[PDB]
Design a protein around this ligand. Structure first.
Ligand code: 9YG
Length: 445
């Protein structure tokens, strides 16, 4: 088997996806940029054997469709899997819809016609997504008229899903009822696309709730209504496709192929009023999801930072021979690499990361800067998410909004209310510092 680091080099972290982090890597000869998903074998358990994974990857490489992500290579070592594929700079689909001023059924029809064309192609090759959601709908380029590329097709079949809430944010909305009970087939992707189509034309999920188990309760029952003012401006054929896509029994449910031939897809692609109420609801929804996610990733980063701060200090304590509390530049690289070796790109990137800390910055001061640089992304994303969530720029977030944020994050109502009081003002609203202080107290600080 070939080695990944010998062919590729890490450029920058693009983000966090399902089953692992996505790194922008570049080929050391041709210079081709690629987005590599790094799945840790310790944190992610396999549902299938090695021969089944190698056979699916081999097929996935030969598959090609303009609305499906392209996979180029695959590597494996003692504790990692490297899925190498194409880079898409357009970002998530919903992040683009919140920035534009006008959105209509013609935009939603062109969006879902692409998603269906991608799903139809992957169904013919006997590949299922299972966890289809807006987060997996990336745009190929920064231009407005850009193709939608679906990511993570077939990973759910070979890798076990996470039980951590930071990895399950917003999944309960789009999951099909048959997937929760065990027996399911490719029709679960039509339900998920049906839920996305519902949110594109209204901005509120069909199966909604104040917590994960309340959302799954509505999904399992399978009941939903078009009883909102925003559904009056929408056509009847759009609702007929939704009714067919959200049919409880999968055998009675429409296929991805037959959904393209529907009267709504054929009329709105081949009067069209703007859905203004849906844009504000998608904006309010997207912001709530991203702040709830950033809150959990901030709490997770503080726990791993405190865990790694004491670990790096214990490694440098043993390496200190005389006991002056100082170490050489070459020694700090051996200890910083030892911290990475114990906790699961290469030696050159590890040596560069130590030089980046030493340019700014005693080994106690080195750990303080090095560990703050690891959390720099999670601290800034939390503040940026709080600012975006606070659309009226009042600087505060009300108790009703906190209950919605903590509700999506699965933090119990009685737990965050006890933490809020440990701020005795009783204002019924909190600023960023007060919100940050609550998250710190909710993760043992
Ligand atoms: C989560 C973010 C938005 C950072 N992300 N995720 C991906 C998907 C992805 C990147 N590499 C993969 C390998 C197997 C399956 C899925 C993937 C991806 C990509 N291609 N290009 C730019 N960003 C990407």
């Amino acid at each position: 088997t070939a080695i990944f680091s010998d062919r590729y080099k890490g450029q920058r972290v693009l983000g966090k996806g399902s089953f692992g982090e996505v790194i922008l890597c570049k080929d050391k000869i041709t210079g081709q940029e690629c987005a590599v998903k790094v799945i840790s074998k310790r944190q992610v358990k396999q549902k299938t054997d090695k021969e089944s994974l190698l056979r699916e990857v081999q097929l996935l490489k030969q598959l090609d469709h303009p609305n499906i992500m392209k996979l180029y290579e695959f590597f494996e070592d003692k504790g990692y899997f490297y899925l190498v594929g194409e880079v898409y700079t357009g970002g998530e689909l919903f992040d683009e819809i919140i920035s534009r001023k006008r959105f209509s059924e013609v935009d939603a029809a062109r969006i879902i016609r692409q998603v269906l064309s991608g799903i139809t192609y992957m169904h013919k090759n006997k590949i299922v997504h299972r966890d289809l959601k807006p987060e997996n709908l990336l745009l190929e380029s920064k231009s407005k008229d850009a193709n939608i590329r679906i990511i993570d097709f077939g990973l759910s079949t070979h890798f076990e899903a996470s039980k951590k809430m930071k990895d399950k944010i917003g999944t309960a909305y789009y999951i099909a009822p048959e997937v929760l009970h065990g027996t399911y087939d490719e029709k679960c992707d039509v339900w998920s696309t049906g839920v996305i189509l519902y949110i594109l034309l209204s901005g509120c999920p069909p199966f909604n709730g104040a917590n994960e188990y309340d959302i799954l309760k509505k999904v399992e029952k399978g009941k939903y209504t078009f009883e909102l003012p925003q559904w009056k401006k929408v056509s009847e054929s759009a609702k007929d496709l939704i009714r067919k896509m959200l049919t409880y029994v999968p055998s009675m449910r429409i296929s991805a192929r037959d959904a393209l031939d529907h009267e709504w897809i054929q009329t709105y692609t081949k009067d069209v009023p703007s859905l203004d109420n849906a844009i504000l609801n998608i904006r309010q929804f997207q912001g709530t999801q991203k702040l709830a996610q950033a809150a959990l990733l901030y709490m997770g980063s503080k726990l791993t930072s405190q865990d790694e701060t004491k670990e790096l200090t214990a490694i440098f304590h043993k390496m200190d021979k005389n006991g002056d509390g100082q170490l050489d530049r070459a020694e700090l690289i051996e200890g910083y690499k030892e911290l990475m070796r114990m906790k699961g790109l290469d030696a050159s990137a590890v040596e560069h990361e130590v030089d980046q800390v030493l340019d700014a910055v005693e080994y106690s001061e080195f750990v303080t800067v090095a560990m703050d640089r690891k959390t720099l992304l999670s601290r800034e994303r939390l503040e940026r998410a709080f600012r975006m969530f606070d659309s009226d720029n009042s600087g505060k977030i009300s108790s009703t909004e906190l209950a919605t944020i903590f509700g999506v994050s699965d933090v119990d109502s009685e737990t965050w209310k006890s933490v809020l009081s440990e701020d005795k003002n009783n204002d019924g609203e909190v600023d960023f510092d007060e919100f940050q202080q609550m998250l710190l107290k909710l993760c043992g600080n």
